[PDB]
Design a binder for this molecule. Structure first.
Ligand SMILES: [Mg+2]
Length: 44
RNA sequence: AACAUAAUUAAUUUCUAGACAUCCGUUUAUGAGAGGAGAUAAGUCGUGUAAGCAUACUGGAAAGUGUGCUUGGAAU
């Protein structure tokens, strides 16, 4: 088990960074569509 | 009236709601009233100024008279 803890914790750190990047992408995509929504209402 | 949500399988919602309330007008019939043309059939008094056509007037209303036309009258 001691050896597994080191490996799992290394993968855990990688997952946190992968999750952080994916979350940022979702936040950015949300901002873009909302900005487009304003343009749609301006056109409408 | 018809947007937007979403989106590291992809889908959801939208994809409306008002207004016909009812005409103006239109056809069929009940039909007061008044005639017309028939049916049943005996009455009624009348009925020789050639006839008819069109038209006018007069006839209690078949007719008479005027005007033109016709022979589907007569005429050596
Ligand atoms: Mg006459």
């Amino acid at each position: 088990l001691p050896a597994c803890e080191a490996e799992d914790l290394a993968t855990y750190e990688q997952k946190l960074r992968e999750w952080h990047l994916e979350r940022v992408q979702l936040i950015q995509r949300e901002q873009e569509q909302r900005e487009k929504a304003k343009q749609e209402y301006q056109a409408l």
